[PDB]
Amino acid sequence: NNGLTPQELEAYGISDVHDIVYNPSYDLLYQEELDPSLTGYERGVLTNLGAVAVDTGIFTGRSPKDKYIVRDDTTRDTFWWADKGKGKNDNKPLSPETWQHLKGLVTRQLSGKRLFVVDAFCGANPDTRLSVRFITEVAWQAHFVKNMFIRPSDEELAGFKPDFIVMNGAKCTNPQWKEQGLNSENFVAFNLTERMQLIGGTWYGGEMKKGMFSMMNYLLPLKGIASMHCSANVGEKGDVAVFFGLSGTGKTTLSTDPKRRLIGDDEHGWDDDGVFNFEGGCYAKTIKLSKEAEPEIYNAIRRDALLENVTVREDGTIDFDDGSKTENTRVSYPIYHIDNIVKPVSKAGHATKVIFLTADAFGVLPPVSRLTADQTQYHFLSGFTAKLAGTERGITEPTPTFSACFGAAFLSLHPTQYAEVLVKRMQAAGAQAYLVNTGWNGTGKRISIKDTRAIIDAILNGSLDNAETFTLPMFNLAIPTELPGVDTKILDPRNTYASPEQWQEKAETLAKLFIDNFDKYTDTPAGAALVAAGPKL
Numbered sequence: 206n207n208g209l210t211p212q213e214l215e216a217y218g219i220s221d222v223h224d225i226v227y228n229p230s231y232d233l234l235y236q237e238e239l240d241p242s243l244t245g246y247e248r249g250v251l252t253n254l255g256a257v258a259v260d261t262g263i264f265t266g267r268s269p270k271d272k273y274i275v276r277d278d279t280t281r282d283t284f285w286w287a288d289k290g291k292g293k294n295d296n297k298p299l300s301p302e303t304w305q306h307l308k309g310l311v312t313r314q315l316s317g318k319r320l321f322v323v324d325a326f327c328g329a330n331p332d333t334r335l336s337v338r339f340i341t342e343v344a345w346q347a348h349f350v351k352n353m354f355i356r357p358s359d360e361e362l363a364g365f366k367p368d369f370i371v372m373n374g375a376k377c378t379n380p381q382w383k384e385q386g387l388n389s390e391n392f393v394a395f396n397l398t399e400r401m402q403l404i405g406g407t408w409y410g411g412e413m414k415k416g417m418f419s420m421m422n423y424l425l426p427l428k429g430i431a432s433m434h435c436s437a438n439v440g441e442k443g444d445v446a447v448f449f450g451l452s453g454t455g456k457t458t459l460s461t462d463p464k465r466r467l468i469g470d471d472e473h474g475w476d477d478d479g480v481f482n483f484e485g486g487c488y489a490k491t492i493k494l495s496k497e498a499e500p501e502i503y504n505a506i507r508r509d510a511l512l513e514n515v516t517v518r519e520d521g522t523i524d525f526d527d528g529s530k531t532e533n534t535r536v537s538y539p540i541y542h543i544d545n546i547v548k549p550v551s552k553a554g555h556a557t558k559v560i561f562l563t564a565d566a567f568g569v570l571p572p573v574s575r576l577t578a579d580q581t582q583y584h585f586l587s588g589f590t591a592k593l594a595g596t597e598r599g600i601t602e603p604t605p606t607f608s609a610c611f612g613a614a615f616l617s618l619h620p621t622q623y624a625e626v627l628v629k630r631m632q633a634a635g636a637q638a639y640l641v642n643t644g645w646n647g648t649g650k651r652i653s654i655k656d657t658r659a660i661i662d663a664i665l666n667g668s669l670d671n672a673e674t675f676t677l678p679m680f681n682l683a684i685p686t687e688l689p690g691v692d693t694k695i696l697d698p699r700n701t702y703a704s705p706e707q708w709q710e711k712a713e714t715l716a717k718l719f720i721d722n723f724d725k726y727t728d729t730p731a732g733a734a735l736v737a738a739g740p741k742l
């Protein structure tokens with residue numbers, strides 16, 4: 206039906222496939238999205254910036270409650286199941302039977318129509334990458350995966366064999382859900398024996414992106430390769446830095462620095478050769494976006510970029526400040542929309558700087574701290590930050606949260622498994638870790654992007670490592686006495702309070718939350734020993 210034969214899709218259970226649009230160019234996608242006869246959520250609008258904008262419907266973020274993984278002989282003893290030992294997680298078990306029902310709904314839905322099939326790679330390295338095949342009936346969805354995943358060359362497509370198949374049946378729902386013990390009529394299901402992901406009900410593109418990240422998070426650590434929820438860049442001297450963090454904490458904004466070559470902004474692996482990007486694009490947040498503060502991200506918004514849920518006025522101009530649809534407004538663009546990037550392949554050497562970004566809503570943690578090896582493990586496992594996004598934050602949150610490894614929602618294995626491989630990679634490279642508060646302090650306002658950038662610079666240029674430091678009580682974090690380019694006043698979180706006693710109060714409350722959260726890791730001699738690295742009242 207074009208590139209692919211209708212019979213190859215029949216193997217997946219899809220029938221009467223009328224027309225196949227295989228690996229569409231950006232030009233065909235542009236034409237497809239602007240088709241005047243499109244209706245509903247398939248419709249695209251042209252903005253004054255040249256980029257097309259879409260409305261993802263009801264779902265403006267991920268639906269963790271609708272995430273299920275089939276429990277069978279492949280995943281039984283390896284997955285970090287939500288219903289097993291100590292472990293707050295979204296890995297809810299699903300029966301092969303219910304899975305077959307869901308598959309029937311999606312294949313029936315995709316049957317008898319024109320489909321968009323995009324073949325792409327997840328992982329920059331040939332040896333550990335997943336060849337993924339995406340099937341959708343909605344043009345902008347194909348566009349999303351074209352932007353986010355690694356676009357294969359013509360010769361690569363020649364002998365392309367899918368390792369994983371993602372079927373997006375956003376238009377259908379499961380009416381038998383109550384009867385089947387599911388959360389709702391929507392679903393994001395994974396089956397590792399069949400190597401497939403099914404999406405129903407939710408149009409949100411993030412589900413495909415994070416779904417494959419969840420799969421990489423399962424496969425890579427099993428072979429000794431770290432799978433990380435971080436941004437990464439390289440300086441001209443070949444020095445690599447990785448920035449860990451949750452939604453909206455600064456991974457994207459802080460890694461996009463003109464003096465450094467961007468490797469990626471969200472998901473990376475770490476093998477014997479170094480750090481590699483899993484993706485071929487960036488997924489930036491756009492609420493309150495200002496070209497003055499984020500010129501590189503602003504300029505990447507042009508033809509081929511795909512805006513999501515932003516408010517477009519009558520004259521086609523965008524209102525980036527408007528969060529009435531959702532505060533989780535986004536834009537995806539192929540990585541090349543950023544000028545200073547690593548190419549042709551998104552990879553670099555071993556990371557020597559590991560930065561943990563935390564958006565502290567309590568206004569307790571210092572702007573920056575140099576972590577000891579034990580504190581590194583402790584804070585990585587604790588993953589304290591704020592859920593300021595992921596479905597609509599920046600006003601409906603920040604919700605204080607402890608997200609193991611700074612990405613609990615995408616972990617398929619136990620948090621300790623990610624911690625050990627990461628610690629292994631850091632040791633071999635002599636990497637140092639730092640904790641950075643991109644959140645709030647005593648002023649009730651977020652730390653300015655300018656002060657944060659100066660801090661990142663200080664870390665990257667080593668001025669932080671050679672600065673005199675003193676210990677912050679309770680948390681026992683080593684903070685610099687002064688830093689070039691940064692206002693000395695903010696370095697000590699107690700100073701932003703009219704009384705350090707006010708700080709004491711909040712700091713004791715936060716410390717208790719940390720101690721409470723960590724107790725679930727004290728089971729092993731290791732976890733038990735790490736308690737000494739955490740807060741002490």
Ligand SMILES: Nc1ncnc2c1ncn2[C@@H]1O[C@H](COP(=O)(O)OP(=O)(O)OP(=O)(O)O)[C@@H](O)[C@H]1O
Nearest residue numbers: 451452453454455456457458490643652653654657
């Ligand atoms: N000091 C600061 N440092 C970083 N980001 C800041 C700061 N002050 C405000 N922000 C805002 O916080 C948000 C951080 O978003 P960013 O896209 O970097 O999050 P992320 O870590 O990449 O999240 P995700 O995992 O969802 O991609 C941006 O909207 C940015 O403008």
Ligand SMILES: [Ca+2]
Nearest residue numbers: 434451452471
């Ligand atoms: Ca992310």
Ligand SMILES: [Mg+2]
Nearest residue numbers: 457470488489
């Ligand atoms: Mg991002």
